[PDB]
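Quick entry between incubations.
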Amino acid sequence: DKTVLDANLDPLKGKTIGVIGYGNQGRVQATIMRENGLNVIVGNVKDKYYELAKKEGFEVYEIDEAVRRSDVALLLIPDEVMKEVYEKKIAPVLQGKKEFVLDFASGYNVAFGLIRPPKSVDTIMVAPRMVGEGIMDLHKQGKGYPVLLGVKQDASGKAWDYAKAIAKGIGAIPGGIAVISSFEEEALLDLMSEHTWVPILFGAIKACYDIAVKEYGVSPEAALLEFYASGELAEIARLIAEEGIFNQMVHHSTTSQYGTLTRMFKYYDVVRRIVENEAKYIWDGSFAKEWSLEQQAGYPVFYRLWELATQSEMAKAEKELYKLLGRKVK
Amino acid sequence: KTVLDANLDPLKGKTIGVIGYGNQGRVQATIMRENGLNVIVGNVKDKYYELAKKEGFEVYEIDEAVRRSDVALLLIPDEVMKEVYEKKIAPVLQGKKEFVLDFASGYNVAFGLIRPPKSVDTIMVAPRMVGEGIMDLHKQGKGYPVLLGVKQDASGKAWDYAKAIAKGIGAIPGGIAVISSFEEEALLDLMSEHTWVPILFGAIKACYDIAVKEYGVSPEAALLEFYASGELAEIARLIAEEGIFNQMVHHSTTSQYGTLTRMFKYYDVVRRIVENEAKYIWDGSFAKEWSLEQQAGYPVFYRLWELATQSEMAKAEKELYKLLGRKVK
Amino acid sequence: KTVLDANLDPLKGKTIGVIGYGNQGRVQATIMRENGLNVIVGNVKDKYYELAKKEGFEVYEIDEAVRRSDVALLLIPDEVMKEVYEKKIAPVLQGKKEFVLDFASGYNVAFGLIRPPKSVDTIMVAPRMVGEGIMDLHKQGKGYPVLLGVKQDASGKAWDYAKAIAKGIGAIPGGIAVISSFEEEALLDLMSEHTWVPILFGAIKACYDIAVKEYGVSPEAALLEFYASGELAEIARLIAEEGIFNQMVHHSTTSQYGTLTRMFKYYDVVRRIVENEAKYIWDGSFAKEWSLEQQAGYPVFYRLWELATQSEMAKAEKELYKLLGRKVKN
Amino acid sequence: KTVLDANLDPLKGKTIGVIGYGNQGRVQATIMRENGLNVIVGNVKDKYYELAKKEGFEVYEIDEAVRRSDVALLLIPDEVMKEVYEKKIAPVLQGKKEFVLDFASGYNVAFGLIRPPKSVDTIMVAPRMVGEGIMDLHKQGKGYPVLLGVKQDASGKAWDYAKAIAKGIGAIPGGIAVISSFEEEALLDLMSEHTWVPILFGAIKACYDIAVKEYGVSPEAALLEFYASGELAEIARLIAEEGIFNQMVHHSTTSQYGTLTRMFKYYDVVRRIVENEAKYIWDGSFAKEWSLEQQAGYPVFYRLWELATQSEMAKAEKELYKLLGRKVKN
Ligand SMILES: NC(=O)C1=CN([C@@H]2O[C@H](COP(=O)(O)OP(=O)(O)OC[C@H]3O[C@@H](n4cnc5c(N)ncnc54)[C@H](OP(=O)(O)O)[C@@H]3O)[C@@H](O)[C@H]2O)C=CC1
Ligand SMILES: NC(=O)C1=CN([C@@H]2O[C@H](COP(=O)(O)OP(=O)(O)OC[C@H]3O[C@@H](n4cnc5c(N)ncnc54)[C@H](OP(=O)(O)O)[C@@H]3O)[C@@H](O)[C@H]2O)C=CC1
Ligand SMILES: NC(=O)C1=CN([C@@H]2O[C@H](COP(=O)(O)OP(=O)(O)OC[C@H]3O[C@@H](n4cnc5c(N)ncnc54)[C@H](OP(=O)(O)O)[C@@H]3O)[C@@H](O)[C@H]2O)C=CC1
Ligand SMILES: NC(=O)C1=CN([C@@H]2O[C@H](COP(=O)(O)OP(=O)(O)OC[C@H]3O[C@@H](n4cnc5c(N)ncnc54)[C@H](OP(=O)(O)O)[C@@H]3O)[C@@H](O)[C@H]2O)C=CC1
Ligand SMILES: O=C(O)C1(C(=O)O)CC1
Ligand SMILES: O=C(O)C1(C(=O)O)CC1
Ligand SMILES: O=C(O)C1(C(=O)O)CC1
Ligand SMILES: O=C(O)C1(C(=O)O)CC1
Ligand SMILES: O=C(O)C1(C(=O)O)CC1
Ligand SMILES: O=C(O)C1(C(=O)O)CC1
Ligand SMILES: [Mg+2]
Ligand SMILES: [Mg+2]
Ligand SMILES: [Mg+2]
Ligand SMILES: [Mg+2]
Ligand SMILES: [Mg+2]
Ligand SMILES: [Mg+2]
Ligand SMILES: [Mg+2]
Ligand SMILES: [Mg+2]
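Done. Structure below.
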C-alpha cells in the first residue's frame, strides 16, 4: 500500500542543497548527489574532515553561511549534538527564511521534542537502512537500497514532492524501495533494536560461558570457538538476509532444527514481557530523560560499564586466544 | 592447554577410510588426498557416489572399506549413525584385533546411544568452521580450529593418532587444536542451538508483533530495520575479527549506552533460562526427547514449520523480497 | 462459505476404490452402488469379507484395488492407516500420473504422520453424523452434513472432485457441505473428546462421590437422578431440534435460573481448561503422546479401565441395572 | 601486600604543589615543610589565604602554581574538583611532558567524572585517619595508615613516587601503607556512609519512637541510655585498642549473650541491605544520583535536614542539653 519506488527529480533542478556534516555519512549522500549533477555545498567545523573535504572541490563554508546560501540541507550530524548546533547557530537564522526545508537522518531529536523548528518551515526524514559505506560498494553497480520517509510539518503543500524526490538523488531509487513512515516510528525501530535483541544476544553468550566454565568444567579456549569466534554468526546472517529467516534452516540438520523451534515458542512469552516493558519506556519519552541527563553529569555510568565488560572473565580469556591465533585485535 | 603441532609419522603405513561424502566428507577427504595418504571412501551408491566415481576414489561398500582399513572417519550425521553401527559395521569390529574410529560430533557417544567395544580406540575431530570455506582456507594455507577427545583407549596412543590426524585435514600447523571430551562438545554444540539461537528469533518475532499490532507501524518498514538490511551481516564480521566488546566504538553512544544498561539488566534472566536448558541436556533428557520423535513419525517437527511458515511475519516478508528480487519458498 | 450442490460427472467415467468395510465403509459403499457407479471393495479377508462377498461387491487385495481404481475412500481408522500406507499402498502410488486419496478423519495428515507424494491429490470427506442413522436416512431421502478440505492439488480440480463426491454418498443435495481443512478437521474432532466429554463424566463422578460419602445419600437414588434416566436424551433431542438456549422454556424457572447464574460464573474456568487443551493439540503434542502409547504396549490405557470399571460408582451401578433388567455388563 | 618504607629522593630535586589549604591541606603541607621541602600553596584568596600567608608559605594562583611545580596534591573536595579541572588546570597540563596529580579521594576518577590526559601520571594518597589528630600525632612521632593506587602510568615510576610521597606526610616509617585502587577507594569510603552509619541512626530513631509512643517511657530517660552518654566512645575506644570481638569480656554476660544471639539472627538481612547498596555504587548509579542534585538546586538535601531537625526526637533532645549545659544548637 505505502510502497514507493519512483519519483521525479524535477523539483530540485533550480534549488541549492547544503550538505551538513562530512562524517562517514556525508561523504556518501553528497557524492552520489554530486555525480548526479546538482549544485551542492558543504558545511562543517574545521578539522581533518574539512582538509579532506577541501581536497575535493566542495564549496565548504561555515555552517550558518551555508544555511543562508542554500535552500535545503541534510543535517547529517549525530543524534547527540544536533541540539546544541540548532539552538546556538542555525535556528536564529531560519526566521530569516520564508521558503526552506531541513532534512534529517535520525529522528531521535524530533519525535521526542528535543528540537522544535518553526511553522514557516518544512521538516522531513530520509533514513538509509544500510551500513552506509556498503552503499558506495554497491551504488557503482546501479543497484539502490531502502530508505524511510516522514513528515512533521508541511507549511508549503509540497513536502512529499521534496522527500520523494530527494531519495532519487542519493542512490536509493529507482532501483530499490522507499517506505513511508513518521519520525515517531523512525526512532522506535532504530532504538528497539539497540535495546531488545542486541543485548539479549550478548547477555546469553555471557551466560552460556559463565555456566559452561564455572559450573560444568569446560576449557575456556573451546567455549569461545563454538559461540562467537567461528563463522556461525558471520554466515547465519548472510543466509537470513538472502533466503528467509524461517527458510535458511533446511541447510542445517534436524538436530539443529528441532531444538530451535521447540524452544523458540517456549520463550516467546518471556521476551514479549521484556519488549513490551522496553517499548513503553520509549514511547513515553522516558529514555531521553535518561540519556539527556547522562550527558550533563559527565558520563559516570557509561564510563563504568566499559570497565566491567572489558575486565570480565570472558574478555580476559578471549583477548589471549586471539593472541594465540593472530587476529587484528586490542 | 593447547596443541599446535604433531607429527604425521604414525599415519605413514595405515589406511584411512572416510565414510560419507557430504558437506564435510569431500573436504576432509580431498585435503588428505593431496597430503600423500592412501585413503578410500565408502557410501551407498547414489548421486554423491557418482561424482565420487568421477574423482578416482576407491568408493566401495561400507563394510568392505572396514575389513580393508584399520582406521576410519565416520562423517555421517548424528541421526542415522546408530542404524549403520548396529546393522552394518559393528558386527565386523569384533573381527578387528586393532582399530580406530574417528567421529565428528559426539552426540551419539556421550549420551550412550552407541557403545563401541573395549578392544577399540575412540577419538574425535570436530571442525569448528562453516565447512565449505575450509577448502578456500586450505589453498591459502591458513588452517582452522578443531576439538579433540577420547572415550576409550587400549593402545596407549589414542592421542598420537588424534593429534596427528588434525595435521592432515588442513587444521594445523597454522590454526590451533583444543583438548576436550565428547561430553563437553555435545553440550557446546547443542546449547548454542537452544539458548541464543531461538531467543534471537524469539525477539524479532515479538519486536514485530508489538510494532505492527499495538503501536501502529508499517510492516514493510519493521523488517527493513531488524534483519532485512546489511546490519546483521556485518555485526558478526566485526564481532569475529575485532572483539565482542570492541566493535562498539564504531557505533555511537546512543547505541552503546542503551545496549549495556540493558545487558546487565537481563543477565539474571537468560542465566535463569540457560541453567534449565543445560540441566535438561547434561542429564540426557534431550536424547530421550529427540530419539522418540524419530520413532513416532515426526509429528511435532512437521507442525512447527507450518506455523513459522504461515505466521503473520513471514507472510509479509515473503512478499517484500518479491519486491526486491530474491527467491521464495 | 456454504455449499449445497455440485455435479457428479467428474467421477463418472472413472472407477472408485472403496477401502475398508467397517461400520462406515458399508454406508458410503452401498449408497454409491445404489446410485449406479462402478466401485470395488478392497479389504483384508475376515468376517467382513465373507459378508462383503455376500453383498455382490468385487473384492481384490488392497494393493490390487487401489491400482485398479482412479480414486479411493480410505475408510480405515486413524490408528492403523500409517502401517498400510507405509507398507502396501504408497510404494504403488508412484506408478500413477493422476490419482486421489479420499480420507475420512485427518488425524493422520494434519499432524504429518503420513506424507503423500507430489503427483497426487488429497481431499477430506467427513460425515458429521451418527453414521448408522445414515442408512436409516437414505431409506428416507434426506441427506446430511459433511466437511471438505484439501492438502495438495496438482490437477486444478481438487474441488470439482470433492464437491462432487459428497453428492454420491447421500449428503447433497438435501443437506449441506462445509469448507474446511484437515488442520481444522482434527481439532474439532478432538476438542470434543478432550474438553466437554470428560468434564461431563468428571462431574457426575464428583456429584456422586460428594452426595454419598459426605452428605448421607442412598446410592440407588443418586444414579436415578443423574444418568439412569433418559432425561439426557430429552436434553439432547431438544438441543438438536430447538436451540441450545431455547430448550429451557420447556423446563421451569427454578431450573433456568440456577443454570444461567452458574454458566457465566464458570465460563472463565472451562475457558482456561480448553485454552490449554487446544494449544496441546495445535502443536501436535498429542500425536507424540498417542503414537508412543501404541509402541509401549498400551500400559496406561489398560490401567484406567480397571479404575473406572472397579470404582465406587460403577460397582453400585452394575447392580442397579440387575435390579431393573437392562443390559448388565456382558 | 604490606608496605612499610620507601625512599624520599624521587621527590627531592622536584617541586611539590600543594592545592587547597583546608582542614587537610595544612596537615600534609606543614609536615612536608617541617621535613625541609620546597613546596608552594595554590589557592583562591580568602581567610584561608591570609592565614596561609601568615604561615610563611608561598601562594600563587592555581594555574600559576601547577605550572611552577612537578607534582601536586589536589586537596580540594570531591564536589568542586570537576569545575576546577575542567576550567583552569587541565588546559594547562597539555603543556607538560612529565607530571603527576596526587588525589585524596577517588570519587572523581573511578566514576570517570574526570579524565586526565595520556602524558600524565595519576596516583592516590588517602589518609585513613581523623586528619586533625595527625597533628596531635606528628608532635608525638608515630605515623598512621594510608592507601595507594594508580589509574595510569607513563613513566615506569608511578609507584616510586607514590611509595615515596607517603614518607613525607608523616605516614611512614612507623605506620603502614596499603596497596589498592581508586575503584576500591571510593567503595570503602562510600559503603561506610551508606550502610552502617544510617542503620545506626535509623535504629535509635526507632528505639525512641517505640519506647515513647507505644510503651510509655519518659523522653528524658530514653536518650540518657542510647546516646546522651559517652558509652558509644567506651565502645569505640575499646574496639580500636582491643578487638571488635574482644571488647566484650569487659562487659557482663547479660550484655554478651543478647548481643551474639541477635548478631547472627540479623546477619542475613543487613547482608541484603548491603548487597543492594554496593551494586548501586559499583555501577556508578550514585554519581548520577549525586551529580544531578547539584544541578537542580539541592532540593531534597534541604528538605531531609528539616525533617530530622524538626522531628520528635531532636525536639526533646535539644531541650535536655539545655537542662545539662552542653552545646545547645547554635
Ligand atoms: N552504525 C552507525 O553508526 C551508522 C549510523 N548512520 C548515520 O549515518 C551518518 C554517520 O556518518 P559518520 O561519518 O559516522 O558521522 P561521524 O560521527 O563519523 O562524523 C560526524 C560529522 O559531524 C562532525 N561533528 C562531530 N561531532 C561534532 C560536534 N560536536 N560539533 C560539530 N560537528 C561535529 C564531524 O566532524 P566535521 O564537522 O569536522 O566534519 C563529521 O563531519 C549519521 O547520520 C549516522 O546517524 C547510519 C548507518 C550506520
Ligand atoms: N553442519 C556443519 O556445518 C557441521 C557439520 N559437522 C558434522 O559433520 C557431519 C556433517 O553431516 P552433513 O553435513 O549433514 O552430511 P550431509 O547431509 O552433508 O551429506 C550426508 C552424507 O551422508 C550420506 N547419508 C545421508 N543419509 C544417509 C543414510 N540414511 N544412510 C546412509 N548414508 C546416508 C549421504 O549420501 P552417501 O551415503 O551416498 O554419501 C552423504 O554422503 C555431522 O556429523 C555433523 O555433526 C561438523 C561441524 C559443523
Ligand atoms: N465413529 C464414527 O461413527 C465416525 C467414524 N468416522 C471415520 O470413519 C472411519 C471409521 O473407522 P471404524 O468405524 O473404526 O471402522 P470399523 O472399526 O467400523 O471396521 C474396521 C474396518 O477396518 C478393517 N480393519 C480394522 N483393523 C484393521 C487392520 N489392523 N488392518 C487392516 N484392516 C483393518 C476391518 O476389517 P476388513 O479390512 O476385513 O473390512 C473393517 O473393515 C474412521 O476413519 C473414522 O474416523 C467418521 C465420522 C464419525
Ligand atoms: N572531611 C573529612 O572527614 C576528611 C576528608 N578528607 C579528604 O581530603 C579532602 C578534604 O576536603 P575538606 O576537608 O572538605 O577541605 P575543607 O572543606 O577542609 O577546606 C576546603 C578547602 O578547599 C577550598 N575550597 C572550598 N570550596 C572551594 C571552591 N568552591 N572553589 C575553590 N576552592 C575551594 C577552601 O578555600 P582556599 O581554596 O581559599 O583554601 C579550603 O582550602 C577531600 O579530598 C576529602 O575527601 C581527608 C580526611 C578526612
Ligand atoms: O541509530 C543507529 O544506531 C542506527 C541503527 O538503526 O542501527 C544506525 C542507524
Ligand atoms: O548439527 C550440529 O549439532 C552442529 C552445530 O552447529 O551445533 C553442526 C554441528
Ligand atoms: O474417533 C474419532 O476421532 C471421531 C470423533 O467423534 O471425534 C469419530 C470421528
Ligand atoms: O425435576 C425438575 O426439573 C424440577 C425442578 O424444577 O427443579 C423438580 C421439578
Ligand atoms: O570522603 C569521605 O567521604 C570521607 C569519609 O568520611 O569516609 C572523609 C573520607
Ligand atoms: O547498659 C548496659 O548494657 C548494662 C547491662 O548490664 O546490660 C548496664 C551495663
Ligand atoms: Mg540507533
Ligand atoms: Mg541497528
Ligand atoms: Mg548443532
Ligand atoms: Mg552452532
Ligand atoms: Mg475423535
Ligand atoms: Mg465427537
Ligand atoms: Mg566517606
Ligand atoms: Mg568514614
